[PDB]
Amino acid sequence: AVQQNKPTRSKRGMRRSHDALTAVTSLSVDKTSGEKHLRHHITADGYYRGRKVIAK
């Protein structure tokens, strides 16, 4: 269950082929402040869908 021959850098890279990260890259500007954020997520201060939903 161990290993038989040592794999290569080639095999180490082809395995990490699909380990590659992926960004969001397409954000939304709010109607009120326009501060970019994630779709369906509040802003840093509490704005969401053009509304202060944090109420604070």
């Binding site: 369906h40 997520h41 509040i42 969401y48 939903v53 944090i54 109420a55």
Partner: protein, 120 residues
């Protein structure tokens, strides 16, 4: 499988879920908005709404069934006096789920579950 088995396990005991959703429903009523993960938010929504559904009609019998659940009179007093009247005409969603971000520690998608009509 779990075909049509609506209920979320939350990696806990069944005896833990009855007491976690009892104390978390309690701090949602004492406060008005709390912060937790979505899988707790989508589920607390299933427990706190049947309380606002309940407290629309006051009676000695409804106080007991609202005291078996939530196990504290202060929440029972907050119910039937505040929320029942404050959500009377509306027939439906008495709370709102609202996604915010993540935790630094374990990277859990969080959300602010909030009771509606908090523009006082």
């Amino acid at each position: 499988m779990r075909h049509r088995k609506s209920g979320r396990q939350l990696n806990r005991n069944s005896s833990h879920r009855q007491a976690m959703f009892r104390n978390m429903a309690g701090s949602l009523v004492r406060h008005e908005i709390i912060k937790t993960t979505l899988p707790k938010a989508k589920e607390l929504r299933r427990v706190v709404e049947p309380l606002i559904t309940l407290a629309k009609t006051d009676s000695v019998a409804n106080r007991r069934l609202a005291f078996a659940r939530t196990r504290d009179n202060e929440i029972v007093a907050k119910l039937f006096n505040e929320l029942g009247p404050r959500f009377a005409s509306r027939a439906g969603g008495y709370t709102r789920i609202l996604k915010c971000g993540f935790r630094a520690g374990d990277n859990a998608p969080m959300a602010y579950i909030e009771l509606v009509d908090r523009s006082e």
